Design a protein around this ligand. Structure first.
Ligand SMILES: OC[C@H]1O[C@@H](O)[C@@H](O)[C@@H](O)[C@@H]1O
Ligand SMILES: [Ca+2]
Ligand SMILES: [Mn+2]
Length: 207
């Protein structure tokens, strides 16, 4: 179901016939996979994918869905950077499976909106501002989780659904951060803790 010609893998990521592998269950990884054609953010964007965050609750570090207006070679930091930290201009939806000091006020595995490659939730909330991170409890349960991301180019809003539950919303015009055109894709990291991490894209609709 994955057409490998449509995806560009960087770092420790690999394109498989049925999934986008972001990290293997090994230390110090960063992986990214970008879709080959940019989307037009003056139209709506809906992305649905299954995410797998591993089977070890004591593992790390998490994944993102990222919109960024650079290109298909971008790869952010390892570990708590989730393969995303440093990429700008960007907006990311992180699924974060390791509590770093900069993750306050999160208390569990969490989903959050990050901007321009910043993964510090207090900084982003003081600067942009982004919403607080949303605690999911443990998502390193060896199950695939359904994530749906909705950009509405009329209302200038973003919604994020996890396992069918509205988890985050945002009222910032993301085109004023990244421009009207962006690559989309996925990133993952591991550090001093680890997990197998992958996504299975289901549906992408632009307009
Ligand atoms: O992997 C979990 C964590 O491990 C620590 O040793 C560092 O690698 C952090 O960057 C990382 O978030
Ligand atoms: Ca983290
Ligand atoms: Mn986080």
């Amino acid at each position: 179901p994955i057409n490998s010609s449509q995806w560009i893998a960087n770092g420790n990521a690999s394109i498989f016939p049925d999934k986008l592998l972001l990290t293997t269950d090994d230390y110090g990884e960063a992986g990214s996979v970008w879709y080959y054609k940019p989307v037009n953010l003056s139209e709506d964007l809906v992305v649905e994918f299954y995410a797998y965050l591993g089977d070890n609750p004591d593992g790390a570090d998490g994944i993102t869905f990222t919109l960024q207006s650079l290109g298909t070679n971008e790869l952010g930091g390892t570990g708590g950077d989730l393969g995303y930290g440093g990429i700008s201009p960007s907006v990311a939806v992180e699924v974060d499976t390791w509590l770093n000091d900069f993750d306050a006020p999160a208390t569990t595995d969490h989903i959050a909106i990050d901007v321009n490659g910043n993964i510090n939730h207090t900084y982003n909330s003081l600067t942009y501002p982004t919403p607080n991170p949303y605690d999911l409890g443990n998502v390193e349960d060896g199950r695939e989780h359904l994530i749906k991301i909705v950009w509405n180019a009329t209302t200038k809003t973003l919604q994020v659904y996890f396992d069918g539950n509205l988890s985050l919303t945002w009222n910032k015009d993301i085109t004023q951060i990244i421009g009207n055109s962006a690559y989309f894709g996925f990133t993952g990291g591991t550090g001093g803790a680890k997990n197998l991490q992958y996504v299975k894209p289901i549906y992408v609709k632009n307009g």
